[PDB]
Amino acid sequence: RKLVEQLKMEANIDRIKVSKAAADLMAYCEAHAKEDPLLTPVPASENPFR
């Protein structure tokens, strides 16, 4: 009873192509890769733990 109603709501949902989602995630990663202190080691002058 409850399940039939529940999957009825989950059936009618718009979905986008996988290529678009992959492109968006890779674009976000490429754009924000500059300010990632763990990807590229920072100068030792601004490393509070060293």
């Binding site: 995630l25 890779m26 890769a33 763990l38």
Partner: protein, 335 residues
Amino acid sequence: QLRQEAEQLKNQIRDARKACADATLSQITNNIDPVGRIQMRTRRTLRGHLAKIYAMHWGTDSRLLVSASQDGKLIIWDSYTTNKVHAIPLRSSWVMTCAYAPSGNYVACGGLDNICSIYNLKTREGNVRVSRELAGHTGYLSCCRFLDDNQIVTSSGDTTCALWDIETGQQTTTFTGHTGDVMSLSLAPDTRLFVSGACDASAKLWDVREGMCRQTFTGHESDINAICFFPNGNAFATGSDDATCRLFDLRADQELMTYSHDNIICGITSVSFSKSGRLLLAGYDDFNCNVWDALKADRAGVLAGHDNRVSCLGVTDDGMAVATGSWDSFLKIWN
């Protein structure tokens, strides 16, 4: 009847999902330059816990953090100078989770006593004392996260979650639908949705304002132990105990990549992302943590400084350090 009609929609959903799979994330990202080799060295080591550690949460200022141990203590540290600030004694020695409020005024805790407790840190004319005890669950607490200074979301082993009101101690709403113990949860960057992974190998996407489930993902094969959003807010990752991780997409409503290796046969205790969402750090039962690549599924470093099972793992808001905890009662800050 109803049972037959149930399976009719379960096959319609799979048809809709398969129609949108133009290509795979591996195929698209073939030309991305590999990240290379990433090596991290321990910078600080924190000592003082008398027993194994289950929980840890970073502060919003990226300087203080809280830890929970089975000896019945809640110690607040100072990572920059390695100085203990507080040590709250607990009524029950079986603690399984902890959290740190965004404003820093309060700290939450819970465990096998089925109760969530909030401690008022920044009090006037006195020490830290318990402020409110929240009761009503019928199973051990698994996680709890703060939305703001007056609300908190908790999940327990009675296959349900709940949204509390600290001022009055009442359940504003409850979320039902899982058929097994709920093991973790994580709030969205804008705190409008959250996801929870249970022991029936399924993760759901709840809505805080309404109180209803929206999507369900069933890619795993066994228990789910960890979960975390991508920094974007349009994806998340899971970690199961069959030595596999997966990346799910909300908009595409299906799995994108799997992070597995042939030489790993141990379970996963925790996962976490990086500041830019490019690296994925995971914990393991085999005493060390591995660093993956989000867009390539290629391992790019191992952190092997612990002498026992790793139980918790967290990354600071500014993306400058990684904190890990283990069952040997030691924390380590990597950089």
